[PDB]
Amino acid sequence: SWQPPNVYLETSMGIIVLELYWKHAPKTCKNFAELARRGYYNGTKFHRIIKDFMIQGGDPTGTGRGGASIYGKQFEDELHPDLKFTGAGILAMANAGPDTNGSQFFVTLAPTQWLDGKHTIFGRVCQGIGMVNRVGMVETNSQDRPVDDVKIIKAYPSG
Amino acid sequence: SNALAIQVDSEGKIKY
Amino acid sequence: PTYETMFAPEFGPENPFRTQQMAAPRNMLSGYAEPAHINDFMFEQQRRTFATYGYALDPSLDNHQVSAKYIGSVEEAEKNQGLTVFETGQKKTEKRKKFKENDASNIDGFLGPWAKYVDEEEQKELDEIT
Amino acid sequence: SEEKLQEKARKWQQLQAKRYAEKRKVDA
Amino acid sequence: WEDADFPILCQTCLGENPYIRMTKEKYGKECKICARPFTVFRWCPGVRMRFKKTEVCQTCSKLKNVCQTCLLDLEYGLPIQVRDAGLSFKDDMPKSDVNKEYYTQNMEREISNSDGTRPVGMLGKATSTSDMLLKLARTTPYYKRNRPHICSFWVKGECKRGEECPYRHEKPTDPDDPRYYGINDPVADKLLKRASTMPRLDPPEDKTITTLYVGGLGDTITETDLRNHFYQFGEIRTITVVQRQQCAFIQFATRQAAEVAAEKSFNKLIVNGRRLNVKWGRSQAA
Ligand SMILES: [Zn+2]
Ligand SMILES: [Zn+2]
Ligand SMILES: [Zn+2]
């Protein structure tokens, strides 16, 4: 269990440094540390991309179903009463419903307060907020799927 | 918006 | 094909940016329209059951994944306890007696099935509107 | 449970006497 | 010029039967706007009801997300200009016979051949909705739309049909209040109906009610939600989140911005999925 907060994620758009919040949810941070250590994402494409609401990825299939954890196939949601979905660039765990978490993830684009009591607020981007704003402008269909490959080159859980 | 949607690929130059 | 693939739910906050109707599935601009091969007769029977008595069984495939109720106005179904229109009912009540002349002998007196039944201030407003 | 145990038979052998009755396998 | 497979048809026009039988032609009537030969469909909604065939083509329904026969909104059950003013954009269409009329219908059909799923330009602004239109979206619709229109010869008292007159009787219509965009007669009354609702009386002072008893916080509203919904209004002078009653107290310096909060929250400010609780505060040193 380490907590240097920087994450040296290497994507097709560019290298983004992501600040993990080991302060508020160490469990999901340790699970993604273990998985990105084992390289679950070295060559995974973002799947659901919505303008001004969220950018979702982490699906190896890209079909909105793939995901596997160390605590079973699914693990637990965690919260904090001062981290709320308020702002852009807010990394979080992609989810179906509570008491369940897949390996997928997403970031948001706006103060989205009605989702604070649901999902694990998992990180935030510090270098590369223009990067995630540029990635947020990929054209997608009504099924929210991209045009060409936008794929994670390499993952590093730096710390 | 009023303007179009600006698209550049992930790696290379500006797509037209 | 496997059950786990199609039954796997979707990760996400469901995208509440849309309205209810545009987020809802379709193929036609108004609902997913798809063919069917129901029996003609039971279609017509439960159709006429609703058309007369205001209740029928509900048609579905995946609403609740279990659906076995009645619809329309509910309580009159169990007032008749689920009888149909093609059934000789439990009682013969509120019938209405026609008068019959089925001889074909009298003239202007023979009414067979053509029998008219035994039962056989506003105009100021109508003249002021017109 | 009480008379439904034969009323369902009434409905079934009522309905099936029209389900396949009139030689479904009037035209000319 | 146009074939079809199934019509658009908002729910009040189908009728109360889930089992309806419906007939189709191949080139039926013409569209009553653009004279285009669609495929007219006919059915019986209900046992006391007229047949209500099909009025405009599928193209002139896909233009404005309108149902097929009663000419109302497919998302709401509302007239056309209620939607276009309530979405503040008109999606123009000409008026004459050719002058850009069948030209633009032909070309907007040609660029609608791919999707067949959503309206052509309304798709972007039909999302940012549900605030000003949802207050008037009359669900559980009244089926007086489907009743057969009033016969003559009861109007003249002549109707020899007696009971079996299928149409109606004893509904004399009134010649004082009865196309596609504007202007329509009952719509002006309905927008006067929405502009003139029933609020609380505005009390005789000079804007002293900057406080307000808004509550019903429960577990939905938090402190930063309501003060960032008021930070776009402006500045507070004192907030509190009094959780014995699940309530929140905010004020404004020089009332006006919180004034529209009084306009936003007459049982009307709907954030986080709740009809919020609102009654009037003191502003009286009480
Ligand atoms: Zn037309
Ligand atoms: Zn209609
Ligand atoms: Zn009449």
In the 8-state DSSP scheme, what is residue A37? H
The alpha carbon of E241 is separated from its chain's Cα centroid by a whole number of angstroms, namely: 36
Distances (CA, A) of D19 to C86, E17, E211: 12, 23, 72
A58 labelled ligand-binding: yes
Partners of A91 in beta bridges? A107, A123
Whether residue E157 is found in the same domain as residue E189: no
| Contact indicator for E89, E126 with CB cutoff of 8 Å | no
* Residue E238 one-letter amino acid: T
Of E136, E163, E197, the one marking the end of a domain is E197
For residue B10, give the nearest of A137, A139, A150 by CB distance.
A150
A28 labelled ligand-binding: no
Domain edges within chain A: 1-159
| Contact indicator for E227, E204 with CB cutoff of 8 Å | no
Residues 6+ apart with CB under 8 A from A35: A41, A69, A70, A103
Q: Residue E124 — φ and ψ, nearest 5°?
A: -85, -25
What is the number of structural domains in chain E?
A: 3
| Contact indicator for A43, A155 with CB cutoff of 8 Å | no
Is residue A17 classed as helix, strand or coil in its secondary structure? strand
Start-end of H helices in chain E: 11-14, 59-62, 80-86, 101-110, 185-195, 223-231, 256-264
- Residue burial C50-72, b: 16+ Cβ < 10 Å; e: rest: bbebbbbbeeeeeeeeeeeebbb
| Contact indicator for E117, C23 with CB cutoff of 8 Å | no
Contact list, C42 vs chain D (CB under 8 Å): 15, 19
Exposure of E46 by Cβ count < 10 A (0-12 exposed, 13-18 middle, 19+ buried)?
middle
Which of these, E34, C48, C47, lies nearest to C58 by C-alpha position?
C47
**Cα–Cα distance, A69 to A76 (Å, whole number):** 10
Crossing angle between the packed helical segments C40-53 and D4-19, to the nearest 10 degrees: 120
**Cα–Cα distance, E80 to E87 (Å, whole number):** 11
**Cα–Cα distance, A26 to E108 (Å, whole number):** 55
**Cα–Cα distance, E83 to E97 (Å, whole number):** 25
A15 labelled ligand-binding: no
Is residue E258 classed as helix, strand or coil in its secondary structure? helix
What DSSP line would sit under E47-88, residue for residue? TTS------S-SHHHHTTTB-SSS--BTTTS--HHHHHHHTT
Start-end of H helices in E180-272: 185-195, 223-231, 256-264
Residues 6+ apart with CB under 8 A from E84: E90, E91, E181
Contact C11 A53 (CB under 8 A): no
The alpha carbon of E281 is separated from its chain's Cα centroid by a whole number of angstroms, namely: 33
Note whether A117 contacts E: Cβ–Cβ < 8 A: yes
Which subunits count as partners of chain D given 3+ CB pairs below 8 Å? C
Note whether D8 contacts C: Cβ–Cβ < 8 A: no
Whether residue E99 is found in the same domain as residue E83: yes
For residue A48, give the nearest of C5, C12, C16 by CB distance.
C12
Given strand A54-57, what is the order of strands in its sheet?
A: A44-45, A151-154, A8-11, A15-20, A121-127, A88-93, A105-109, A54-57, A48-50
**Cα–Cα distance, E168 to C21 (Å, whole number):** 35
**Cα–Cα distance, A106 to A89 (Å, whole number):** 9
Q: How far is A143 from chain B (nearest CA, A)?
A: 19
Give the method used. cryo-EM
Contact list, A148 vs chain B (CB under 8 Å): 9
Q: Which of C38, C41, C49, C81 to mutate to test the interface with D (most CBs of D within 10 A)?
A: C41
Count CB pairs under 8 A between chains A and B.
13
Q: How far is A68 from chain C (nearest CA, A)?
A: 13
Q: N- to C-terminal Cα distance for chain D? A: 48
**Stated resolution in angstroms:** 3.4
Catalytic residue among A115, A127, A133, A145: A115
Of E162, E197, E232, the one marking the end of a domain is E197
Is A95 catalytic? The answer is yes
Whether residue E234 is found in the same domain as residue E124: no
The alpha carbon of A2 is separated from its chain's Cα centroid by a whole number of angstroms, namely: 19
Whether residue E87 is found in the same domain as residue E192: yes
A48 labelled ligand-binding: yes
Count CB pairs under 8 A between chains A and E.
19
Note whether E66 contacts C: Cβ–Cβ < 8 A: no
**Cα–Cα distance, E64 to E95 (Å, whole number):** 15
Residues 6+ apart with CB under 8 A from A23: none
| Contact indicator for C72, E16 with CB cutoff of 8 Å | yes
Q: Residue A89 — φ and ψ, nearest 5°?
A: 65, 25
- Residue burial E188-206, b: 16+ Cβ < 10 Å; e: rest: eeebeeeeeeeeeeeeeee
- Three-state SS across chain C? CCHHHHHCCCCCCCCCCCCHHHHCCCCCCCCCCCCCCCCHHHHHHHHHHHHHHCEEECCCCCCCCCCCCEEECCHHHHHCCCCCCCCCCCCCCCCCCCCCECCCCCCCCCECCCCCCCCCCHHHHHHHHC
| Contact indicator for E95, E108 with CB cutoff of 8 Å | no
Q: What is the CA radius of gyration of chain B?
A: 9
Whether residue E191 is found in the same domain as residue E168: no
Which of these, C84, C46, C63, lies nearest to E20 by C-alpha position?
C46
Which of these, A129, A122, A105, lies nearest to A13 by C-alpha position?
A129
A103 labelled ligand-binding: yes
| Fold of the domain built from segment(s) A1-159 | Cyclophilin (2.40.100)
Is A65 catalytic? The answer is no
Is A106 catalytic? The answer is yes
Whether residue E113 is found in the same domain as residue E250: no
Is residue E41 classed as helix, strand or coil in its secondary structure? strand
Contact list, E130 vs chain C (CB under 8 Å): 19
Q: Domain containing E105: what range?
A: 1-147+179-197
Dihedral sign for Cα C21, C23, C25, C28, please: positive
Where does residue C75 fall: left (phi above 0), alpha (psi -120 to 50 degrees), or beta otherwise? Answer: alpha
Is A115 catalytic? The answer is yes
CA of E19 to the centre of ligand 3 (A): 29
Dihedral sign for Cα C119, C120, C125, C126, please: positive
Chain A residues 65-104 within an 8 A CB cutoff of chain E: 84, 86
Contact C17 A53 (CB under 8 A): yes
Which of these, A29, A17, A6, A44, lies nearest to A152 by C-alpha position?
A44
Contact list, E157 vs chain C (CB under 8 Å): 123, 126
| Contact indicator for A85, A108 with CB cutoff of 8 Å | yes
**Cα–Cα distance, E61 to E11 (Å, whole number):** 15
Contact B11 A12 (CB under 8 A): yes
Is A56 catalytic? The answer is yes
**Cα–Cα distance, C95 to D7 (Å, whole number):** 24
Catalytic residue among A31, A48, A91, A101: A48
**Cα–Cα distance, E130 to A6 (Å, whole number):** 41
- Residue burial E257-277, b: 16+ Cβ < 10 Å; e: rest: ebeebbebbeeebeebeeebb
**Cα–Cα distance, E59 to C97 (Å, whole number):** 54
**Cα–Cα distance, C10 to A106 (Å, whole number):** 13
Residues 6+ apart with CB under 8 A from E222: A84, A113, A116, E241
| Contact indicator for C50, C42 with CB cutoff of 8 Å | no
Whether residue E86 is found in the same domain as residue E158: no
**Cα–Cα distance, E275 to E278 (Å, whole number):** 9
Contact list, E224 vs chain A (CB under 8 Å): 84, 86, 113
- Residue burial E62-90, b: 16+ Cβ < 10 Å; e: rest: bbbbbbbbbbbbbbbbbbbbbbbebbeee
| Contact indicator for E269, E212 with CB cutoff of 8 Å | no
Residues 6+ apart with CB under 8 A from C104: C110, C112
CA of E62 to the centre of ligand 1 (A): 10
Residues 6+ apart with CB under 8 A from A121: A21, A24, A25, A79, A80, A83, A84, A85, A90, A91, A92
